[PDB]
Design a protein around this ligand. Structure first.
Ligand code: NAG
Ligand code: NAG
Ligand code: NAG
Ligand code: NAG
Ligand code: NAG
Ligand code: NAG
Ligand code: NAG
Lengths: 228, 319, 84, 35
């Protein structure tokens, strides 16, 4: 508990620091604003083109020309501006589709990695997803994930089963890791190993089929001490 | 089969619309920024058409290998693993794939076309997939979360079974049989693919579509768009600029419009390819570096494991 | 301008499937990618100082020494916290 | 349900866990089975 706590706490400290100093990890949120500003900026700048007329100012076209033709220059400007608007709106639609995608993705990632311990690997974050935490952000959301990352190996030598009384005892919840000497401690993912009672095993069959069985004893926790 | 890319291409706007024609260029400028953004959008498409590849065949972090002795209880997968003989280290399946999916180019180049080369050439992509696969054969559901832990392969298939619902017992006992079933099935795969009942189909449409679109574009650079001609030179060799303007504008308008159409199509397709690549990225990191209980989200029926395989412009999963 | 003149000549040229980037150096080593060009060839600054282009490296080569009967258990666990 | 050694399991001593409430445990065989 404390030694797990300590880790959690310190690590949250890091999340701050990695997003506190000036490492710009908020690129994905910045890009949206930059793209939108650029689009609006271009749309505004498109007003200074005359699309092949004499000028790009309406007050200027009327004051040097006669309405018989003026319409042609005006129509030119009209067409140009209109096309520009079309382009802007179309790219806005396309971008909105992507933002909607990113949303639905996020919405899922919420439901699962924040109201549950969803298993699916690399959908909450690298490792196994203990728990998460959401944090809102300018035009977006930021997830924190608290995961389980194993380290510090031990390359022990397993077997596949333990035949003791001519019958084959398969392992219940671990993968029987006969460590170097007394070949029988039965672990489980981590390292806590205990002796093979007939309660972490489950008998099945005879000792010829599963190739690789290595005999020794399967201890029985009942008879030989309470024979009263 | 799943597509994960698209031939990244752009088109130098100006030289498309105008051909070298200074007067044309000038007239074009007048039309505002209306093709800086064009080129920009295409470039954005390209960048995405690369990051896609990164998302899928690059979620490993450490290229692994395989032991020199093949003591796997019995599985003979020397299909999926790379075979030294073939030049670019490629599994036989990968080869069959490449050779099947196949397709002027420099000619349409001579119109403004450009087909930028990928950042991840094939050999590297293969190498990544080989890594992943190798990791799976001897790390199980671990090299995708934390370090990489060796587990003997019989001994690993058992735990996946345990996942399915059958208890370890089954596998360890009737090992011989399941070995053979696996063996032969892998055998059949090369046939089914190497046959031609529209196998690598989806990976082919991407190409056909793109090519076709590009071709349409080029062809449109031959339509007078309702102007005197469509070569720009004959206008500028029969007329003075005063009158030239008229025809020149007619053309410029038509050509620009076409270029628009093309880029908008390209964008809408790139969105779909991105969706497909995201689906891949999941499929990989949920049905390749780990079992998944999402029915059919890894394949038909209960799922034991998968194997990825690289194919032109796309991933080919062997579930 | 005579400043564009140095960037069209010289002994520093390395043809690539990408193209003919000039002002580079095709070292025989391999590092992790930086500014990405295409077809593998990457480039970045280094150490007396010059933009180098290198055939990118995919990562450190490992080999999970697996035998036929040796399982490996992790014996301590570090709780990271990641961001997205 | 009554606490027996059938629905629980043993691990370690009783000075490491916080809040362990040390209080009783029944066993399946401990009755007349222990004749
Ligand atoms: C448990 C088991 O099968 N161990 C085998 C061993 O008997 C054999 O000598 C060696 C060589 O392949 O491979 C391993
Ligand atoms: C291998 C070992 O040490 N002991 C036993 C032995 O009682 C047995 O019948 C033998 C047959 O190979 O295998 C097991
Ligand atoms: C399919 C193929 O290419 N040949 C290999 C061969 O080296 C080996 O004998 C066989 C198992 O019998 O596994 C495979
Ligand atoms: C894991 C183990 O068995 N022992 C040590 C223990 O002294 C330590 O401070 C703990 C923290 O997780 O990790 C290591
Ligand atoms: C509860 C009980 O009956 N006996 C022990 C006693 O020695 C101990 O230190 C106490 C503290 O609450 O808990 C346990
Ligand atoms: C790189 O290696 C090749 C052959 O191995 C050699 O010819 C060349 O001079 C080397 N270049 C440098 C810069 O070391
Ligand atoms: C709960 O907290 C109290 C302090 O208010 C403490 O005395 C007690 O031991 C705690 N019980 C636990 C942790 O089970």
């Amino acid at each position: 508990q404390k030694l797990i706590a300590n880790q959690f706490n310190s690590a949250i400290g890091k999340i701050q620091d990695s997003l506190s100093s000036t490492p710009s990890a908020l690129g994905k949120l910045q890009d949206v604003v930059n793209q939108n500003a650029q689009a609006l900026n271009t749309l505004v700048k498109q007003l200074s083109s005359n699309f092949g007329a004499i000028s790009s100012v309406l007050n200027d076209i009327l004051s040097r020309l006669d309405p018989p033709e003026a319409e042609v220059q005006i129509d030119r400007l009209i067409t140009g501006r209109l096309q520009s608007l079309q382009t802007y709106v179309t790219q806005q639609l396309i971008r909105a589709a992507e933002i909607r995608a990113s949303a639905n993705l996020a919405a899922t990632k919420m439901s699962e990695c924040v109201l549950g311990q969803s298993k699916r690997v690399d959908f909450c974050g690298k490792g196994y997803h203990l728990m998460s935490f959401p944090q809102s952000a300018p035009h977006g959301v930021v997830f924190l994930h608290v995961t389980y990352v194993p380290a510090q190996e031990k390359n022990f030598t397993t077997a596949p089963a333990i035949c003791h009384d001519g019958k084959a005892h398969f392992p219940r919840e671990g993968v029987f890791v006969s460590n170097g000497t007394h070949w029988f401690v039965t672990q489980r993912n981590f390292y806590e190993p205990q002796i093979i009672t007939t309660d972490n095993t489950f008998v099945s069959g005879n000792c010829d089929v599963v190739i690789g069985i290595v005999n020794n004893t399967v201890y029985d926790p009942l008879q030989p001490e309470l024979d009263s | 089969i799943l597509p994960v890319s698209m031939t990244k291409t752009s088109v130098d706007c100006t030289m498309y619309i105008c051909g070298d024609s200074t007067e044309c260029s000038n007239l074009l400028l007048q039309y505002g920024s209306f093709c800086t953004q064009l080129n920009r959008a295409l470039t954005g498409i390209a960048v995405e058409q690369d990051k896609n590849t990164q998302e899928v065949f690059a979620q490993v972090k450490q290229i692994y290998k395989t032991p020199p002795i093949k003591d796997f209880g019995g599985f003979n997968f020397s299909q999926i693993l790379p075979d030294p003989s073939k030049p670019s280290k490629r599994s036989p399946i990968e080869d069959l794939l490449f050779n099947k999916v196949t397709l002027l180019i420099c000619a349409q180049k001579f119109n403004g076309l450009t087909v930028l080369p990928p950042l991840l050439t094939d050999e590297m992509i293969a190498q990544y997939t080989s890594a992943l696969l190798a990791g799976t054969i001897t790390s199980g559901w671990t090299f995708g979360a934390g370090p990489a832990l060796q587990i003997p392969f019989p001994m690993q298939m058992a735990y996946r079974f345990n996942g399915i619902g059958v208890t370890q017992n089954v596998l360890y006992e009737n090992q011989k049989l399941i070995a053979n079933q696996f063996n032969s099935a892998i055998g059949k795969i090369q046939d089914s693919l190497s046959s031609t009942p529209s196998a690598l189909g989806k990976l082919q449409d991407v190409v056909n579509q793109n090519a076709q679109a590009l071709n349409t574009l080029v062809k449109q650079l031959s339509s007078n768009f309702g102007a005197i001609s469509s070569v720009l030179n004959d206008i500028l060799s029969r007329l003075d600029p005063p009158e030239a303007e008229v025809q020149i504008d007619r053309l410029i308008t038509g050509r620009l419009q076409s270029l628009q159409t093309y880029v908008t199509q390209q964008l809408i397709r790139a969105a779909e390819i991105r969706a497909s690549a995201n689906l891949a990225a999941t499929k990989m990191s949920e049905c390749v570096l780990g079992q998944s209980k999402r029915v059919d989200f890894c394949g038909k029926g209960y799922h034991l494991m998968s194997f990825p395989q690289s194919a032109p412009h796309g991933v080919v999963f062997l579930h | 301008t005579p400043t564009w003149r140095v960037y069209s000549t010289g002994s520093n040229v390395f043809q690539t499937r990408a193209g003919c980037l000039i002002g580079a150096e095709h070292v025989n080593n391999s590092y992790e990618c930086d500014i990405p060009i295409g077809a593998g060839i990457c480039a970045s600054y280094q150490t007396s100082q010059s933009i180098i282009a290198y055939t990118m490296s995919l990562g450190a080569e490992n080999s999970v020494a697996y035998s036929n009967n040796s399982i490996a258990i992790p014996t301590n666990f570090t709780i990271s916290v990641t961001t997205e």
